[PDB]
Design a protein around this ligand. Sequence first.
Ligand SMILES: C[C@@H]1O[C@@H](O)[C@H](O)[C@H](O)[C@H]1O
Ligand SMILES: C[C@@H]1O[C@@H](O)[C@H](O)[C@H](O)[C@H]1O
Ligand SMILES: C[C@@H]1O[C@H](O)[C@H](O)[C@H](O)[C@H]1O
Ligand SMILES: C[C@@H]1O[C@H](O)[C@H](O)[C@H](O)[C@H]1O
Ligand SMILES: C[C@@H]1O[C@H](O)[C@H](O)[C@H](O)[C@H]1O
Ligand SMILES: C[C@@H]1O[C@H](O)[C@H](O)[C@H](O)[C@H]1O
Ligand SMILES: C[C@@H]1O[C@H](O)[C@H](O)[C@H](O)[C@H]1O
Ligand SMILES: [Mn+2]
Ligand SMILES: [Mn+2]
Ligand SMILES: [Mn+2]
Ligand SMILES: [Mn+2]
Ligand SMILES: [Mn+2]
Ligand SMILES: [Mn+2]
Ligand SMILES: [Mn+2]
Ligand SMILES: [Mn+2]
Lengths: 408, 409, 416, 409
Amino acid sequence: MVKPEEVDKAYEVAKQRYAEIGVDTDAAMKELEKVPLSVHCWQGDDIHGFLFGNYPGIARTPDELAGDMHEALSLIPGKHRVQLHAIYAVTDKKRDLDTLEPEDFDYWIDWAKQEGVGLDFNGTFFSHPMVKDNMTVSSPDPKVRDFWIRHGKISREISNYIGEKLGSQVVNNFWLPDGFKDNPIDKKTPRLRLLKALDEIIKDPLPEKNTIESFEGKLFGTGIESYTTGSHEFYQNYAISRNKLWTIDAGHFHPTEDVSDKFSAFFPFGKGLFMHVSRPVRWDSDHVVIMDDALIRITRSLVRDGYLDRTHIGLDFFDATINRVAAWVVGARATQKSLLQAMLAPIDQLKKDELNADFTTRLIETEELKSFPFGAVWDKFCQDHNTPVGFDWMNNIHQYEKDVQFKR
Amino acid sequence: MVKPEEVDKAYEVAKQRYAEIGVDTDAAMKELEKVPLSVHCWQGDDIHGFLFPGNYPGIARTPDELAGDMHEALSLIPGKHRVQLHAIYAVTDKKRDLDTLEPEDFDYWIDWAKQEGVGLDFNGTFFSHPMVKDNMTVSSPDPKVRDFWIRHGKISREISNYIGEKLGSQVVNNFWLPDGFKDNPIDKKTPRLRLLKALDEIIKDPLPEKNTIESFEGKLFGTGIESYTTGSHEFYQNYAISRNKLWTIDAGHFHPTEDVSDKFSAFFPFGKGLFMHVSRPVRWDSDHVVIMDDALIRITRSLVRDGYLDRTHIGLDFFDATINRVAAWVVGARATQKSLLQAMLAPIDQLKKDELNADFTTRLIETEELKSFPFGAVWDKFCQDHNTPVGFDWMNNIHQYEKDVQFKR
Amino acid sequence: MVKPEEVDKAYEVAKQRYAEIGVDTDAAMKELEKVPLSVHCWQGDDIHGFLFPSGNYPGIARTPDELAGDMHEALSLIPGKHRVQLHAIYAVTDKKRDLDTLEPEDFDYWIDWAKQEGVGLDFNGTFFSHPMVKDNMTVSSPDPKVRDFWIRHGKISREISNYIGEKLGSQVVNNFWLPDGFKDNPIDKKTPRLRLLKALDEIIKDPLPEKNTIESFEGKLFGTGIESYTTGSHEFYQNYAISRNKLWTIDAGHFHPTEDVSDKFSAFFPFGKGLFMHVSRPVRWDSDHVVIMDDALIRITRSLVRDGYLDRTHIGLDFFDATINRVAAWVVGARATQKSLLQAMLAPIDQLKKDELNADFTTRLIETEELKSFPFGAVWDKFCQDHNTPVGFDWMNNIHQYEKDVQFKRDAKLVH
Amino acid sequence: MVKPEEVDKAYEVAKQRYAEIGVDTDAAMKELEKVPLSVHCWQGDDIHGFLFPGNYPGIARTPDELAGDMHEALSLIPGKHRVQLHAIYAVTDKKRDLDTLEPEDFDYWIDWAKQEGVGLDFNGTFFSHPMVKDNMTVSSPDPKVRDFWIRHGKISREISNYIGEKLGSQVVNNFWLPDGFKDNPIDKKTPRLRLLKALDEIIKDPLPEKNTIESFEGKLFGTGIESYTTGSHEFYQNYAISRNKLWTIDAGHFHPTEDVSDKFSAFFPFGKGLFMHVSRPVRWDSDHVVIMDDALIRITRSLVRDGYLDRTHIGLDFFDATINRVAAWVVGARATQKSLLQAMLAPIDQLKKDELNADFTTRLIETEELKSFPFGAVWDKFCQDHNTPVGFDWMNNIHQYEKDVQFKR
Ligand SMILES: C[C@@H]1O[C@@H](O)[C@H](O)[C@H](O)[C@H]1O
Ligand SMILES: C[C@@H]1O[C@@H](O)[C@H](O)[C@H](O)[C@H]1O
Ligand SMILES: C[C@@H]1O[C@H](O)[C@H](O)[C@H](O)[C@H]1O
Ligand SMILES: C[C@@H]1O[C@H](O)[C@H](O)[C@H](O)[C@H]1O
Ligand SMILES: C[C@@H]1O[C@H](O)[C@H](O)[C@H](O)[C@H]1O
Ligand SMILES: C[C@@H]1O[C@H](O)[C@H](O)[C@H](O)[C@H]1O
Ligand SMILES: C[C@@H]1O[C@H](O)[C@H](O)[C@H](O)[C@H]1O
Ligand SMILES: [Mn+2]
Ligand SMILES: [Mn+2]
Ligand SMILES: [Mn+2]
Ligand SMILES: [Mn+2]
Ligand SMILES: [Mn+2]
Ligand SMILES: [Mn+2]
Ligand SMILES: [Mn+2]
Ligand SMILES: [Mn+2]
């Protein structure tokens, strides 16, 4: 086990090293504790839900998934949020996606109040017989369109209800699979069908204090490779023109595309972002978030340009090849330590150096900061917030495996 | 030498092949007539211009030389087209800088365009100048640099309005800035707020859409400016939609594997119009001559299938000084035209019906068969009907122009 | 329906057009006849096979007779003489078999069918969809019991391939593809590739006559659930093929974004024996779309034709599309490959080479662009008709008839 | 200025943190000492050389200036390293061309290397010359051009052999050719057969391996040569293995998303050795200064984990003239060293055992935790132990060198 004295000793030296270059480590940690991550429930049960890799101990019930999310949050320092999918409804009533009621989410409101977290929401527009040739809201079939418009409206009603009960705004994220496997003839009509359907879904006004909608594009998915109706361009344009949030998932863009570039091109025009951190490995593979170039650039671009107050950070990944609870903790800690490293830069001075075109100083300093003692500040943050330091939280995972997961 | 009676015979056979699948070749050729390509002047003289005086022989050095070279290229491109100018192609014996240009400095090109029977489009020149400070112009943090380039931007609109009034054809005034960073920036926000404010100042003075409208061209990366581009595609799509201006899509300026033909149908539920710059990137923004490849085929079929040509200006953008510079224009223009024509020769209404009814088998079979239908016989007919050489034959014209003009310079 | 005399007339015109630029259309069609495509059996039944019991289209093959019938139908619409690729799991026997107990006689069904059909056979060992796939690893597993099982399958694939080649009197290319790799970032990249090297050497050790069979080795950049590391890389297998005097398999879907596999041929053939070129359309990943006439296919085919590599390159199809008529999928991909080969053959290649050696890049650009709108379709139509296959749209009639007669009824038919 | 006591206090805590997970920080630093980086001379003078006479002040213009600049950079990079020369950095009062260079023309650099205490690597110069014809050299279809560049190739080996004999350290002699086509070629075979025959002629005359060995460097594409590269990565890996020579991997010269760290373990079952050129591509072969990024982290940890450093020569390759050219070297060298050191500070024996047991949970958790272990405290200790400044402090040295030397030029 890491000795708390060691953490304290390493921190006092780190505090001094950072002070010498005009950085306040105490202030950086206070900033980090204001950034909640929206932890996605569906990693816990391989997005099975309750309505309808192979590591042991998958959650099978609401109680099991709630316990698994409690365990993960207990190993993530600070206070965070949980994302639900519509299919995580908890009810003994026969429901379909077009007959869900707000009170079907009472279980999760009760849990969130006990846990002390806000909730965000996702409509479930997939894994259903009413998905016709990979299309839902923007299907050429009006029966199919009408079904999914009913689900869209219900997702807003559920979100409003949760937000009213919790006293925290529910971000209601819309993702559709809609597109073509092979090359389409008509690219225009599907996107005009989507525009009309979305305008219908958001028509009935709901209190902004309770919920606001975000819209998530994708470049391509398995079996839908050639055309995505809801493109990044379509949804940025839609978000700006309908005054809604735009969702950027770090896994859903071109090879070499840097999603951290988008923020400063959006915010002159738009309201807010839902930034979904996810690791693509050569496709939309939904690998666990790790400290890599993409995460470092996402977190430092939000910190440096002061966009955190208008940017919701959510996790999105599946990994069933590893301990599903560990997966949440790896991804959240990676995101947090990347935010903290960005906060531990002399940003005001670096901005002035850059304004004066001192590219020599900018390169030298940004490179030196990558080997400054940011880990000592992160360890101090973990310890101050009653979470295990470094390798130590593996003990907690092993105990949870023995006591809970391996007994299922 | 192709025999005209052979071209006519092969056309009548192709007309019948296409009629049998519900395609009217006569109508397709009338549709192609209505698509003018904006031919870029700067391929003729390696963007030297006249304002501030590969290695194939016969580069244009004077206005008369460049005007003659563009006349020769247009004589080998069937139908009616347009020419793009850069501000540095001003023709004047007065001492000018980019911030002191006057509309009359372009009288030479208005007179030439009237003679040639073509419209003109325009480009402000925001590069190759001492007032480019650390690769930044309009959105420089230096207010002296900003104010210089804002004066040029305002003057570009004044010139474009004047040309548009004189020609009675709308001048599309394309804005491209190099502005960005070689290496990783700290502040991505402030440069884009500087750009927003400066662009708003440039477009402030009211001018009639009838004479000119501005288009805004983004870039992912350029040589020596690799890490950050102030004017991103997202920034300019947002700006064009917000300010009711045109958005410029250059086929060479996007990510590896990015299909710019995807953008049109995501723009037109929101925006006014496009300036589509066809250009061949080879693994970077290399500005190769446009050829009939996946990208050009997808750009052209996406515009005709979805009926966007009436709101899309098509311009050429490439440099190739390793080949006959006049030939480069004709290859690019003909590649674009035959690609448009192939898209127009599809049974688009029936294919749309089959796709709406989820018959993806028929869509795949038919779209593949159409690639080996006799579209060439229709293209040859279009060339001959518009008094241009067929197939290989226009190399004779290039060789003669080399002998008579280019090789004597 | 096209009129045969219309096709013949359009051909005579195209023949004259090409003759005027020094191209012999008669000779081009004779060259195309000499390129057999190895049509993959597994598109017919979504790689189910018969050993262990995206797309939805009716009429999936469920039995050897049904698959054989489906391949016969597809081949009847593909002009000329071709080959069929088998997978080990397409063994036909009443005897209870595993991948390490298959016998050459288990492929007598396919030998008899190939002889009747007038096609050669290529072979693929099946190193996937099996309980003995341990953490996505087979031949190069760190578990010696798993390694040994898959080495037994590897040796059996060669014995089967040798037997088939002897019976058919046509060399069987025996293609090796392994899924082996990691989902996430590995610590040790060296040891898995040393385990692979040793296991492959053990599989090929016992000599078999080259006239009957030779092995080819297929690399991959990444697969679903195995994204971060592939034990059998393209570099590993090109090195292995050259050093062990075996063929190298290039699958057009298995490389980096923007990677042009047509670049590889001329860097391989100064050193290596032969290629198995697997034409496949990737759409943003290894999606195994039906082959279409696109930049990649045009470049693969013209690079093989221009540089005279067809005599040392076996061309196979590899794609999976169950969202469309599975029989039509074969015909689209086969015809796209053939018409792309034929367009390449209809170029004045000797003169274009001379112009290029003289650095006449102007003539090269103009002529290569003009050739894309020469009447290559009229030569393709003539080739289709001469080889008793339908012209252009006409083969959709044959597919609709096969749907009525076979595919739309098949699910309700008793399996036997 | 960082206090040595701060470095020592942080190191003692880090040493304990690492000891607790079975990692020996003292041993890791001894391992880093055995990895010399081959610092490229041509960053110092923007590849001008002396043979054929960004815009940051103080460019080196003479041998003494460039030698001084390399001494300054090496004085700020901890440990012992090497310097790479290009043929155009010949130092002589004699009239030379690339085909008349003599080994004694490098006596200047042998003497400098001995007094500096470094080994030398070598590069033939196959660019920026009238005898580069249509971007081709050794593999030109013109036998006059081929023969000129074959003579330079043979001379590069004679020079490398002579330097190796004098220094008693093997000179790695790296071959890079620009040879290729701007646009799509008809014949891909014949250029590569011309290259094969020409390279074989260059290496024909036996020279002692104790003095020199050749390495062969491929490229995917270069500016003005985008469509085809005669010397491909496949060609040269095949050539190196076949002719028992070294293969050069430049991290900037591959496809988008290509991970060159994948190549090592596919090469070493077959080949003799590598020359790894660390370089940062930004969307093309842009030759940015090496920084601590995914590519550098993967390159360094792949060499360390699989024990390939003793068969892999690590060289720098970048040119950035927009910043202090001496600082560029130090940023790139320190980035490479701290990335090697982080990889050396992992419990690799135990992680390999975990991975063999398919414990992917433990592998993910530990590899992520190690990214925020105190590797900087070990790096700082390495800097201090080897008499170089810690962290930001070496900017003081650069500012002093600017004042005293560079800005006086
Ligand atoms: C969310 C829901 O709200 C009311 O119906 C009650 O307080 C109930 O107990 C609670 O679960
Ligand atoms: C070579 C070719 O063979 C068939 O296609 C026909 O007989 C045709 O007339 C002839 O040109
Ligand atoms: C599960 C589903 O996956 C989609 O690709 C997308 O990332 C959505 O946000 C998520 O709800
Ligand atoms: C010459 C200049 O080049 C730029 O890259 C861009 O394409 C502009 O549109 C053009 O005006
Ligand atoms: C079905 C299997 O798929 C692999 O990805 C590869 O393409 C192999 O060649 C094939 O046998
Ligand atoms: C001995 C003979 O060698 C060939 O190169 C090839 O590898 C054959 O398969 C093998 O049987
Ligand atoms: C300067 C030259 O640049 C090339 O692109 C390559 O990287 C060579 O190694 C180097 O010698
Ligand atoms: Mn998402
Ligand atoms: Mn995803
Ligand atoms: Mn452009
Ligand atoms: Mn361009
Ligand atoms: Mn394959
Ligand atoms: Mn594939
Ligand atoms: Mn290099
Ligand atoms: Mn480089």
